[model samples]
Target chain A: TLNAMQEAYSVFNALGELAGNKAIIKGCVVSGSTTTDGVVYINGEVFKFVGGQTQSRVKILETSTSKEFEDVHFERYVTFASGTGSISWAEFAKLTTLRELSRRLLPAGTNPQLYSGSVNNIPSGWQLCDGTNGTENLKGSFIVGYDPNDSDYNAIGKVGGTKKVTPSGNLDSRSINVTVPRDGWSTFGSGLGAVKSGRIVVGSGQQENSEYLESLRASGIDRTLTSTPHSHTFTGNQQDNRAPYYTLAYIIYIG
Target chain B: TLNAMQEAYSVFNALGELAGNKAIIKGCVVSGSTTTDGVVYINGEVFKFVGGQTQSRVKILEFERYVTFASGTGSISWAEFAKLTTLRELSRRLLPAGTNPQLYSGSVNNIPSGWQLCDGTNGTENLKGSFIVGYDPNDSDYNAIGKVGGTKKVTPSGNLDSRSINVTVPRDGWSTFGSGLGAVKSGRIVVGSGQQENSEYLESLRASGIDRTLTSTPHSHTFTGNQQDNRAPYYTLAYIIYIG
Candidate 1:
């Protein structure tokens, strides 16, 4: 009976086989728990993680046609994609979990219980609750924020935490930031050029302190100017005078 | 045959039924519009409208099992849908259109032409035409980086425009400046492309020590001293004494 089930329903094949046979892994659910790095079962099969954050551990997992039925360790991390080239019309195409047709896909603000709304760019680097998401901000966030608490006024202005970082300042001239975050790994000319690429980048080598501040502000995460406005009066040797201030604006993603 | 077609292909059933089979309404073209509260039929087949703008009721539509047939009312916002994602990838897909591979495909005129280009960040309060999105300064029409005019010109060819309309001097903790010329700022008559010099004006403008204070800056204006004697009718101007 198990052989019959595998033979007819593809219960024993990898997801790629579905596309290969013009078949689809549609309406299927693959649930797993990170609490034990255990087998991620599609019905009850095993799967593993790939390049993304986790379920409680890290839910983004994958398997090729190389394996027999295995899938989603799904996370809220969005990946813009349609599936396999094996199909002609996008209909039979396998647009799965990351953007699967299943109710399993939960977009931003989705209640998950209702499992409503379509897949959306879950605002990378942002977790809705208290304005902080996954630990790494490899791509910058915080676009065009005004830290009006007198930056020179040395008071702890509220930290809105880090939000989505738009690449450029407000494009369209509106005060709002982009709904999605740009890949911060891009560099000058290598990525979204120096200006107006919709990614806020200051300069190449070393720009002024103000320039980097502009980058942070452009990303919508302004470093609170908690350091009060007071000049340091050096009492020690001029050469031995260690700077009397701490600096922070951009929480650097890479270098 | 009608019953057979309806049972097999979902004509007599709800769209939700298609979901049960993983079948999707991919490329059937669900085009309709808000032009007259009407119905658009592909070969007169009954497609409907829900919301969103149009190309004179223009609708570019598509869907996939992925949530496009699972998407919006199905207007081709190309983006917002999955077009932006689909176009970028070469393998697993194909874009046989323009040789232009980069995603920046908004037009020089049409507003809703491209999803990414159609929108932008409106500069805060003081009004400026688009930041990062469209700041073309060489448009011949791009007078300056003000809060007005077409923004697609914000390319390398034109001077970049800041979406900030702060076309004035700095303020707060500072006094008397700008196009508005702050309230406490007094009008100082100078022969140069003048600016209000706060502390400097306090003494000179009061007729203090001298009637005219000329700080050597480049400007064209004539100041003659000791002109108390009015020789208005036939007085001749001279370069030195008696020359008049």
Candidate 2:
């Protein structure tokens, strides 16, 4: 006698096999991660590794925490399937913690958080706050990656430090030293973390030491150093010993 | 009655005072060797510090030798006044060996005789016997200051025995090491029995090693160390290491 319950269980096993087959077949799959307030797509399709029953469950991870995906602070995802069946209605949603979601999503490597806004691009507000209110004041303030492209925030000057200036005959000649930010390293990483390389740009305008920074750029001199980060110091001297007519400007990169 | 000789002597003394007041002056004078060539006119006034009747005449001596009065070579009249009361005139056709010629004309400060023509200036004729040939080798062998603006001749690459090229990067970069020429000190003194100051001119040029002589213009980068007269080894290099 054919039992109805056994037939029903066979149907479930058959469906799982079909889904596994569809998953194993390589093809484009849209994947994404969700935060408490926002959701982001990983932008492309990729193959998923099978890890027995664990492979059946999709997981997302937060790059910063290295744990399961949490709210939209930052996360990455990937696709998975088996030879017998395809995941027709697989969707990861409402991850309360980054660590938990991270286990469900594919490991896309490190995906740095993208920030936009004047201060995020310039890094001015926090720099000024730290300078005026002190380091303790910067506590609890979320610091974004350093953006080398943003000129205003990236440039700096050091006081009592080694300052060099090569002058042209005109007043436009000047250069200053700038220290690159430490966290800016992530910008160079692969995946969605790539950012523009930093450069010292020079031009004229009056904004907190804008003219000086521009002068350094015009002189064909590079103020970049390979040492640890440093702060911009404004020395009182108007001209350098070797080049008297020139001024100085230092710029840094933060993204 | 006023003595004629006394009057003449007084006139000479007054002339000497006027000459002293002139804007230009040379070295002190000496007797015997004091000749007409010693006196020089400065700022429209003639000064006589060259001649005296004493056995040891007062002659003006130069502070240094090889002094160039102007940029080029030429002869100008430099007169020396004497206290003689009478003047003697002699026929040009029958001049004595030591007799002072009334007319004096020739190239002043001629190069030392028999010195090879290592260099020359102006479009002067080049004699085979002349050691320093100033004439352009390509053009007629006439003496002329070679190209006045740029570098002319330089010693062969290895002519300098003491010099070396420390570094080289073809045209893009260069580094070299070599020795500099030692220093030289020169002064003027009496040439004859009497102490007479003579004018002299000094010339200077930089060189590498013992044999590599640099041109008059900028050719090699050279520097000196230690005492002013002491020469030492030098080295230099340059290159374009980075490009966009």
Best by DockQ: 1
RMSD for each model, in Å, please? 36.8, 61.5
What are the runs in model 2 whose C-alpha is more than 4 Å off?
A1-90, A93-116, A120-130, A136-160, A163-255, B1-190, B193-244
lDDT (C-alpha) at residue A51 in model 1: 22
Error of 2 at A113 (Å): 11
Q: Model 2: per-residue lDDT, tens digit, B72-182? A: 233222322222210011111222322211110111123122211211223222211111223456755443543332111112111112222222111111222232112
Against the true structure, candidate 1 has what lDDT? 0.24
* Predicted candidate 2 versus true structure: per-residue lDDT over A84-192, tens digit per residue: 4334324322212223222322112111112334544444322322223211122212221111232321211111111232222111112233332211111111211
| Cα lDDT listed for each candidate | 0.24, 0.23
Runs off by more than 4 Å, candidate 1: A1-255, B1-8, B11-55, B58-244
Query: Ten consecutive residues with minimal summed lDDT in candidate 2 chain A?
Result: A153-162
Instruction: List fnat per candidate, in order.
Output: 0.00, 0.00
lDDT of 1 by residue, A1-255 (tens): 546323322222222222332322342223442121222222222233122222222222333434457563433221112354212322322333322222221123211111122324333333322223322221212111121222321111112221111111211212212122212223333211112212223223333333122112122432221212222121211121111222222221110
